[PDB]
Amino acid sequence: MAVVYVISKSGKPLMPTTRCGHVRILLKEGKARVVERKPFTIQLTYESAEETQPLVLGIDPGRTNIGMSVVTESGESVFNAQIETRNKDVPKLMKDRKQYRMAHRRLKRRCKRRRRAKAAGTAFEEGEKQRLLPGCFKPITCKSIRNKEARFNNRKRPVGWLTPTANHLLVTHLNVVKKVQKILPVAKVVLELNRFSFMYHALSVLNQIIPYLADQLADMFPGNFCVTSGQDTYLFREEHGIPKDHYLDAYCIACSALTDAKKVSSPKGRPYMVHQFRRHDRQACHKANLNRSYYMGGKLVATNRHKAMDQKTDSLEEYRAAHSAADVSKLTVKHPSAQYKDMSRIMPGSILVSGEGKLFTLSRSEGRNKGQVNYFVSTEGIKYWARKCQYLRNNGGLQIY
RNA sequence: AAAAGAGUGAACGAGAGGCUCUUCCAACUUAGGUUGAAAGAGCACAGGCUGAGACAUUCGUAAGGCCGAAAGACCGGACGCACCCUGGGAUUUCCCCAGUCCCCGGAACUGCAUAGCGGAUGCCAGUUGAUUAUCAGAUAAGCCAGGGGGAACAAUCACCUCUCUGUAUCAGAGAGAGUUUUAC
DNA sequence: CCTCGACTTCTAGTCTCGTTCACTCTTTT
DNA sequence: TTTTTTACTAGAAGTCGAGG
């Protein structure tokens, strides 16, 4: 039945097991010591032999659902996972980081300098200046003063420089291989090299990282790194009739390297689920409201005084056109103040226990009153009064649900 | 090889908005208040680093062409600069990285020449201690700031059986050796 | 009969356009 | 000539009881 992973006293991933009774007696015997609650690992506390039979790990690459599966040689299944990456958030978080940065460098230096210039009388006499900068053919308009040197001509990257979003995917894939190697004694590694010519979109960073992952996983398993092919995976899924399921593809990718695989049966049983939680959140501002709202009878009648970029709702300007000065003289303005996040908060991914004693993994902290989170939501979707909950462990990035 | 695809990373420049304040006008209610128009001034995660580096004007920036009466222009690429290299930093942290930036070296490489750098002149800081000196302090038109890990940190008993309560379920609590051994 | 409050319950968050540059992977041919 | 709507965290408004 269940498979209880085992680790040597020396901390060496030994073969797991499936005896159950002995895995309890041996816990009551104290001989052992839980090392993880899921997947259940038990480190022996009586140094014994550490024999470990050969195991193959089939990695099915992917940008949001990395799938892995360690299989015995006969073709038996000892582990099956389905990692859900956060690779789709990294790209957008960086676009925002850019806008934010460019704003800081426009509203806190450029303008300022342009303000201090006009004030000191140290500004272009024309007030504007077209400047054809080396590399461009169309000039750039500089108001009041010149432009901090633009650097876009010879910025060199190391060879094989991969973009933040791609690096992430790669590391992830490998970080998961390392977590699997701390529970089971992995020997060889099969990877399913994918292929998209480009001739629910994405499917791009994977094509760029597949090559680098293959190299990296060839040094992690020196002399033991094979590469299958989606096609083979399919041929297998019709040859051994593995019920088609995105998560049953890794078992197939892995069962390929196996030569005399006699006991190849679909790896039944729901596969473990791993969620990736961000490690650092250096953002401090939750919302800077940015809106001067007007309220005649306490109801918005002007979100600004004049429209803004993409502002659809009417602005005081429109109102003044529709109503009178006796009307505009009664309006009430209400601009809420910027809301800053609590940058030392138990971060989504932490492990906590409820007042009743249920252990859970923070998914999101909903609510705040008098400076105290109102509810800690679990990854299962239950809401617990934070005030009563207890902190146990911080985020680990890849966290099994 | 190009050719495209398909993502994703830089630097610099402009706006619409916004915040505060001033002046003025109008409106509306109690000299006052509220609101708006117009003009002006300042301000732009929380922060960390550093004391100056910003701006303006002017001059200087290789030989080699080649064209000019010349002056000069144009090409070129230096004994010029560099986003390039070597080293060292700031941001920077439990432990790392990215990015950006900075400081001395500049060989190759790579880039630029209306750029960049340097000089000159102008204009924009802060001065107090602890002790002429030294060590703090003060001081921006300095730089970086909304990216990625990893470690460590349990009130971590899973699975099978029985009993009890709830629960349409399922869930909760208690006890248990269930075939050895991770390999007879 | 309120009201004071422990909690529920629920909504909401900036945006666009200039002058350039980059590196990495697939495929076409 | 248009690439794709995500979602945690903060804070205001609301309800349910206390209770006196």
Through-space separation of residue A363 CA and nucleotide B40 C1' in angstroms: 51
Specify the number of domains making up chain A. Answer: 4
- Cβ of residue A305 lies below 7 Å from strand B: yes
- For A105, the token pair is 């460098």
Spatial distance between the Cα atoms of A335 and A160, rounded to a whole number of angstroms: 49
Asked whether residue A85 is assigned to any structural domain, the reply reads yes
Helices A249-257 and A230-239: crossing angle in degrees, nearest 10, is: 90
Through-space separation of residue A62 CA and nucleotide B125 C1' in angstroms: 56
Asked whether residue A133 is assigned to any structural domain, the reply reads no
Domain interval for residue A88: 53-118+161-276
**What one-character-per-residue DSSP string does A133-195 give?**
-TT-SS-EEEESS-------SS----TT---HHHHHHHHHHHHHHHHHTTTS---EEEEEE--
Asked whether residue A141 is assigned to any structural domain, the reply reads no
Asked whether residue A148 is assigned to any structural domain, the reply reads no
Residues 230-259 of A with CB under 7 A from strand B: none
Tell whether A307 and A191 lie within a shared domain.
no
Chain C nucleotides reached by a protein CB under 7 Å: 7-28
Spatial distance between the Cα atoms of A167 and A160, rounded to a whole number of angstroms: 11
Give me the residue label for tokens 């073709």: A75
Spatial distance between the Cα atoms of A358 and A164, rounded to a whole number of angstroms: 37
Sequence-distant (≥ 6) Cβ neighbours of residue A84 within 8 angstroms: A64, A65, A273, A274, A275, A276
Tell whether A218 and A240 lie within a shared domain.
yes
- For A182, the token pair is 């701390």
Tell whether A300 and A270 lie within a shared domain.
no
Q: What is the edge-to-edge ordering of all strands in the sheet holding A300-302?
A: A300-302, A294-295, A332-333
Beta-carbon-side half-sphere exposure of residue A390 (alpha carbons within 13 Å): 8
Asked whether residue A130 is assigned to any structural domain, the reply reads no
- A372-393 burial string, b = 16+ CB within 10 Å, else e? ebebbbbbeeeebebeebeeee
Spatial distance between the Cα atoms of A147 and A158, rounded to a whole number of angstroms: 28
Q: How far is CA A95 from the centre of its chain?
A: 15
Dihedral (CA of A104, A105, A109, A115) sign = negative
Asked whether residue A132 is assigned to any structural domain, the reply reads no
Spatial distance between the Cα atoms of A65 and A206, rounded to a whole number of angstroms: 11
CA trace torsion A313, A317, A323, A329 (10° rounding): 110
Residue nearest to nucleotide B100 (CA to C1'): A101
- Cβ of residue A181 lies below 7 Å from strand C: no
For residue A124, the 8-state DSSP code is -
Asked whether residue A364 is assigned to any structural domain, the reply reads yes
Through-space separation of residue A58 CA and nucleotide B155 C1' in angstroms: 37
Asked whether residue A142 is assigned to any structural domain, the reply reads no
Sequence-distant (≥ 6) Cβ neighbours of residue A43 within 8 angstroms: A6, A7, A8, A9, A11, A32, A33, A35
- Which nt has its C1' nearest the CA of A352? B154
Give me the residue label for tokens 């299989």: A71
This structure's resolution (angstroms)?
3.1
Tell whether A104 and A241 lie within a shared domain.
yes
